Design goal:
Two copies of one chain form a homodimer. Chain A is built from nine helices and 13 strands. Chain A has 294 residues and is of the alpha+beta class. In chain A, the strands form three sheets. The first copy, chain A, has an eight-stranded mixed β-sheet with strand order 1-5-6-13-12-11-8-7, sandwiched between helices. In chain A, strands 2-4-3 form a three-stranded antiparallel β-sheet, with no helix packed on it. Chain A has a two-stranded antiparallel ribbon with strand order 9-10. At the A-B interface, helix 1, helix 2, strand 1, strand 2 and strand 3 of A face helix 2, strand 1, strand 2, strand 3 and strand 4 of B. Bound molecules: adenosine-5'-triphosphate (2 copies), aspartic acid and magnesium ion (6 copies). It is classed as ligase. The entry lists the keywords ATP binding, Aspartic acid binding, 7 stranded anti parallel beta-sheet, ligase.
Chain lengths: 294, 289
C-alpha cells in the first residue's frame, strides 16, 4: 500500500485489544517475580534460525557500528542465556525482531518486523514452561471473552504431539492447525544448537493455535556445555566464528541449565480479533518480501 | 571488558529497580486510556535529530531503510490514524561519537515515547510532573532513600539557561530538584509560533542531566517544508510523511519521550549508564556482545 492508504485503515479495535493483551501479559510475569529487561537490536551475534524446519535459512540484516559489523536481532535467545548467566533467575523482554523473510512466507502469519514476549527461567524443565504457558493462555482467553463478548477455546491444558507424528498424520503443522479446534503442542523438533538434545530427543515445544492460525509460541530447555554446543554448530555447517563471544562464555563454563519461550504478540492479537492477515493489526505493515513505504 | 567480564558484573539491584519502574510507567499510561503500540526499527523515514550524525542504514528487499533515530514521525502518523493517545517502549539506535561517552549516553537505548491528539505544551508538562512525583514517592519505598520532593518544577527559558549557566548540563549540576527548559529551537516537527517554540526538556538534578524532551507539533504542510528546506535537509528523505501532510491528514498534537535507562540510572544512583545495562552500548566502543 501507499502512505495515505496505510493511514486510512480502521485498526482501532485491534490496537485496543493489543493494549489489553500487553497489560495482561506483562503483569502475568511481573506478578511471578520475573525481571523486565530492555531489548537489544544490534550485536556481533544473533539467533541463526537454522537448522529449523520452519525456515528457509535467511541471513540477518547487518550494519557497521564504529567500523564493526553488527547483526540486527533475529532473536534474543543467546542474550537470554547470558542474562541467566548473570544471575537474574527469571527474565522477560518485549523484544522486536527483524527477519527479512521471502515472499514465500507471506502466509498471513508473518511480518518482517515483529515483537515477541521472550522469557527464560534458570533451572526449568520443558514440562514447567509448558505448564506456565498454558496458565497464561487459559487466563488470557477468559479475559478475551469479556473484552470481545465472543467465545474462545476453553481448554486448561493442551494435547501433546511428537513432530514426527504430526508429519505422518497431517503432513505439516499447517494442516494440523487447520484440523484442530483447540491449541495444541508440537514437541521434539530437531533445530538450532541451543535447544537441548539428549540421545536423539529434543527437549522443545511449539504452541499451535487452532483453525489454521498456526504457531504462536516456541521454546525449549537449553544446552549449556561447551563441547556439546560446538559439535552441534559444526554438524549443522554453521561457523564457530559467528558465535565467538558466546562460545567464550560457554568455554569458561558460565552457561547454566535453563528453559524458556517466546510468544508472538501480533500473532496473538490477530487470533483474538479474528483478522485474516497479520498486517491488519499493525499500524505500519511489514509484509514479507515487500519493502514498506512507511 | 571481554565477554566473560561483561557477564561477571553485579546488576541484579539495577534490573530489580528497572522492573519496578517499567511496571509503574506502563500502568501510568494504560490507566489514563493510552493505547500501547509496538515499536518499529526499520523505515524509509526517521527523526533527523537536527538541527539541535546520520542514521544507520540497511537494504531491505533492495530498498534503503533507516534504523530508528526516534519514532517521532510514526507517532504523528498514529495520531493521524485516529488512535487519540498512544505510547510505545521504543528502542533507538544513535551512533554517537566517542566524545559523547559522558556517562549518560549509550548508542542503543529505549525511550517511553508518547503522543496525545489536541494537547498543549502545559498539558504534557503537567502529565510528566504527575508521573515523576508519583515515581519518586514509590522509589522512596523501594530503596529506603529520599528523593526530590517538588510537586511542580521550575520553568526556565532556554536563553536564560545559556546566559546564567552556559548549558543545561551546568544547570543540572547546581539544582536539587527536577526543572524544565522551554522554547528551544530544534527539529522541524516541534511547533514554532511567532519565534517561540512550544517545546520542553525535563532536566534531572545533581548533574544527571536531561531525562525527557517533547513538544507540540507542526501539522501544516507548508510550514513543515519551509523549516526542512531552511535547515538544509532533503525533502526527499521524508517523502511518504510529506505526502500525508500534503494530503491534509496530520493533526495538532503534543507528546514527549522519556529515557528509561537514564531514569533507572538516577533512581539507583549509578555513576555511568553502562552500569544499569546488561549489555553495555558505550559510544565509540563497538559492543563485544
Ligand atoms: N516473521 C514473524 N512474524 C510475526 N510473528 C513471528 C514471526 N516469526 C516468529 N514470530 C512469532 O514469535 C515466535 C518466534 O520464535 P521463532 O523464531 O522460533 O518462530 P518461528 O519458527 O521462526 O516461526 P515460523 O516458522 O512460523 O515462521 C513465534 O512462535 C511466533 O509467534
Ligand atoms: N544516546 C542516548 N543514550 C541514552 N539515552 C538517551 C540518548 N539520547 C537520548 N536519550 C534519552 O531519550 C530522550 C530522547 O529524546 P532526545 O532526542 O530529545 O534526546 P537528546 O536531545 O538527543 O539527548 P541529549 O542532549 O542528552 O544528547 C532523551 O531525553 C534522553 O532521556
Ligand atoms: N521523543 C521526543 C523526540 C526525541 O527526542 O526523539 C518527542 O516526543 O518530541
Ligand atoms: Mg515456527
Ligand atoms: Mg520462521
Ligand atoms: Mg519457532
Ligand atoms: Mg543527543
Ligand atoms: Mg538534548
Ligand atoms: Mg532532547
Amino acid at each position: 500500500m501507499n502512505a495515505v492508504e496505510i493511514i486510512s485503515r480502521d485498526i482501532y479495535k485491534a490496537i485496543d485489544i493489543q493494549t489489553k493483551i500487553l497489560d495482561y501479559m506483562t503483569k502475568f510475569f511481573t506478578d511471578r517475580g520475573f525481571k523486565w529487561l530492555l531489548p537489544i537490536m544490534l550485536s556481533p551475534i544473533t539467533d541463526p534460525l537454522w537448522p529449523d524446519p520452519a525456515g528457509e535459512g535467511i541471513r540477518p540484516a547487518e550494519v557497521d557500528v564504529y567500523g564493526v559489523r553488527m547483526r540486527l536481532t533475529h532473536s534474543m535467545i543467546l542474550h537470554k542465556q547470558l542474562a541467566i548467566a548473570m544471575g537474574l533467575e527469571k527474565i522477560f523482554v518485549l523484544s522486536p525482531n527483524i527477519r527479512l523473510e521471502s515472499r514465500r512466507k507471506d502466509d498471513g502469519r508473518h511480518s518482517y518486523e515483529f515483537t515477541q514476549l521472550d522469557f527464560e527461567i534458570e533451572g526449568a524443565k520443558m514440562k514447567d514452561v509448558m505448564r506456565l504457558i498454558e496458565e497464561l493462555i487459559y487466563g488470557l482467553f477468559r479475559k478475551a471473552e469479556e473484552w470481545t463478548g465472543r467465545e474462545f477455546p476453553r481448554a486448561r491444558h493442551f494435547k501433546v504431539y511428537d513432530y514426527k507424528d504430526i508429519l505422518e498424520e497431517f503432513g505439516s503443522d499447517e494442516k494440523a492447525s487447520m484440523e484442530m479446534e483447540e491449541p495444541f503442542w508440537i514437541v521434539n523438533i530437531p533445530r538450532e544448537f541451543y535447544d537441548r538434545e539428549e540421545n536423539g530427543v529434543w527437549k522443545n515445544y511449539d504452541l499451535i493455535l487452532p483453525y489454521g492460525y498456526g504457531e504462536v509460541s516456541s521454546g525449549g530447555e537449553r544446552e549449556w556445555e561447551y563441547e556439546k554446543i560446538v559439535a552441534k554448530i559444526r554438524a549443522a555447517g554453521l561457523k564457530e566464528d559467528s558465535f565467538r563471544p558466546y562460545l567464550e562464555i560457554a568455554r569458561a563454563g558460565k552457561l547454566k541449565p535453563s528453559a524458556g519461550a517466546g510468544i508472538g504478540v501480533e500473532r496473538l492479537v490477530r487470533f483474538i480479533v479474528g483478522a485474516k492477515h497479520i498486517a491488519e493489526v499493525q499500524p505500519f505493515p511489514r509484509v514479507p518480501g515487500i519493502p514498506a513505504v512507511i
